[PDB]
Design a protein around this ligand. Structure first.
Ligand SMILES: Cc1ccc(NC(=O)Nc2cc([C@H]3C[C@H]3C(=O)O)ccc2N(CC(C)C)CC(C)C)cc1
Length: 367
């Protein structure tokens, strides 16, 4: 079995395969701003170009990849318009001629009108040469914010984790077939292969250190990934001129927008404890609707946890634990990234919540 409807690719997983790089001509005015955000923010010319912008119909965005590219373009255009050079000069009102098409395209794609992980990681890459493989040396992003923002490194290393994970996600029907067929040797190899693929996924995380600089990240890139839900600089949210008369709050950023970590929680039958369910539930809202439909199709399958416990078989318990441990490792290395790239630069909250989820993962071990 596997996807079609859930849009999980055997090669790139939750990411979008071979994402579109160009929009229809009709949207040339958008593409010019997005493609020149580095030059236009540094010069301050960006906000005049957004305000002298006519309102474009979204009707000429006809396929999914075209519409995905347009959301990335409008989201990047939007983040730069709101935060500027980021030293107190915010815009609390997004101009109708960009907000209306952005909100319309968000309604259609069932995502919030703000830059989201499915935009600038999953849909925001190209291969440099397609005849060679998916490595940092042969990959590039479509959009950045500022020269030296380390957009390239932070987005692509993020995407390479999603790709490593695809190696494990594609093993997931074998688990359920082997349970269905009471084929014990197959399910064990499937668990060991999932564990092994999460352990190689952890090794991709090591690459952040070679392409993302903590200061460039904390003081540049993270301002353009900042949202307006619970933000003092936009206490009430952002006004989408012409689409809602009321200001609306939405979050930014967050590794929590990946589906990878929650995907393996559901599989392994790891439940959340605390009220943390609310936060993980809200993270699904910032995911594409197909990927959230997938995480639900997963809870509808028989419990792999109830299956391994019911057999009394110690090899299977050890392979299930290998996966759960590989998951605590990912959450630990996450945490360690938060220390280097946020906590330390902030000294020049989110960690308590993360520690709790890791504890719940570790407590899900069997032997
Ligand atoms: C808009 C947007 C949204 C989302 C991302 N990615 C992210 O947040 N990446 C990210 C951030 C943090 C620390 C800032 C904290 C946080 O987020 O809790 C830690 C790990 C990662 N990952 C892997 C990295 C090794 C590249 C990502 C997932 C785990 C594969 C990038 C852009």
């Amino acid at each position: 079995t596997i996807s079609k409807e859930y849009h999980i690719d055997e090669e790139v997983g939750f990411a979008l395969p071979n994402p579109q790089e160009n929009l229809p001509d009709f949207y040339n005015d958008w593409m010019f701003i997005a493609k020149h955000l580095p030059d236009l923010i540094e010069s301050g010319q960006l906000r005049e170009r957004v305000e002298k912008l006519n309102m474009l119909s979204i009707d000429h965005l006809t396929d999914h990849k075209s519409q995905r590219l347009a959301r990335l373009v409008l989201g990047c255009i939007t983040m730069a318009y709101v935060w500027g050079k980021g030293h107190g000069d915010v815009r609390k009102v997004l101009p109708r001629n960009i907000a209306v098409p952005y909100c319309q395209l968000s309604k259609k794609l069932e995502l919030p009108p703000i830059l989201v992980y499915a935009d600038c990681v999953l849909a925001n890459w190209k291969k440099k040469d397609p005849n060679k493989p998916l490595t940092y040396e042969n990959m590039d992003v479509l959009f950045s914010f500022r020269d030296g923002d380390c957009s390239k490194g932070f987005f692509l290393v993020s995407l390479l984790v999603e790709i490593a994970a695809a190696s494990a996600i594609k093993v997931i029907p074998t688990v359920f077939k082997a349970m269905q067929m009471q084929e014990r040797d197959t399910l064990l190899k499937a668990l060991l292969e999932i564990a092994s693929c999460l352990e190689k996924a952890l090794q991709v995380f090591h690459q952040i250190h070679d392409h993302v600089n903590p200061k460039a990240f904390f003081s540049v890139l993270r301002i353009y990934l900042s949202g307006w839900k619970g933000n003092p600089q936009l206490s009430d949210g952002l006004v989408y001129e012409g689409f809602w008369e009321d200001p609306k709050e939405f979050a930014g950023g967050s590794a929590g927008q990946s589906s990878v970590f929650q995907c393996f929680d559901v599989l392994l039958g790891i439940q959340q404890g605390g009220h943390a369910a609310q936060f993980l539930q809200d993270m699904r809202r910032y995911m594409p609707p197909a990927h959230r439909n997938f995480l639900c199709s997963l809870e509808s399958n028989p419990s792999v946890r109830e299956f391994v416990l019911s057999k009394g078989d110690a090899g299977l318990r050890e392979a299930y634990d290998a996966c759960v441990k590989a998951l605590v490792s990912l959450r630990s290395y996450h945490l360690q990234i938060v220390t280097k790239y946020i906590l330390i630069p902030a000294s020049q909250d989110l960690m308590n919540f993360l520690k709790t989820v890791r504890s719940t993962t570790e407590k899900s071990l069997l032997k």
